[PDB]
């Protein structure tokens, strides 16, 4: 069954865009570091997270 692959890889791309907005890289964020995280969340990201969820 090869249709749900294309059905949800755009949602996977949306979460890749969320990674892009929060860290600067689509896949390899290097965002979580010892001591917490590396950078704070940008303004307006959480509304996008809420809409997608």
């Amino acid at each position: 069954a090869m249709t749900p692959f294309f059905w949800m890889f755009e949602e996977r791309e949306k979460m890749f865009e969320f990674y892009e907005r929060v860290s600067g890289a689509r896949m390899h964020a290097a965002y979580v570091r010892p001591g917490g995280v590396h950078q704070d969340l940008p303004l307006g990201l959480m509304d996008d997270i809420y809409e997608f969820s």
Binding site: D40, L41, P42, L43, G44, M46, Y50, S53
Partner: protein
């Protein structure tokens, strides 16, 4: 200060449980529809096959009339 914060009233409810519709007719309904279609097709095929037999008999008797000259 300004920072990424949820609003004063918070975010709205988000659906997270399964929602299947549950749709279509009852099985008796499709069984009755199929049986009725079967009966209608049987009746129409019966009538047309009887008419075809009559036409074939007519053509055969025309052939029998035409035979002696040939």
């Amino acid at each position: 200060v300004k920072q990424d914060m949820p609003p004063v009233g918070g975010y709205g409810p988000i659906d997270y449980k399964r929602n299947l519709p549950r749709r279509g007719l009852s099985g008796y309904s499709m069984f009755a529809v199929g049986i009725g279609a079967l009966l209608f097709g049987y009746w129409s095929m019966m009538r047309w096959n009887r008419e075809r037999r009559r036409l074939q008999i007519e053509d055969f008797e025309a052939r029998i009339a035409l035979m002696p000259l040939l």
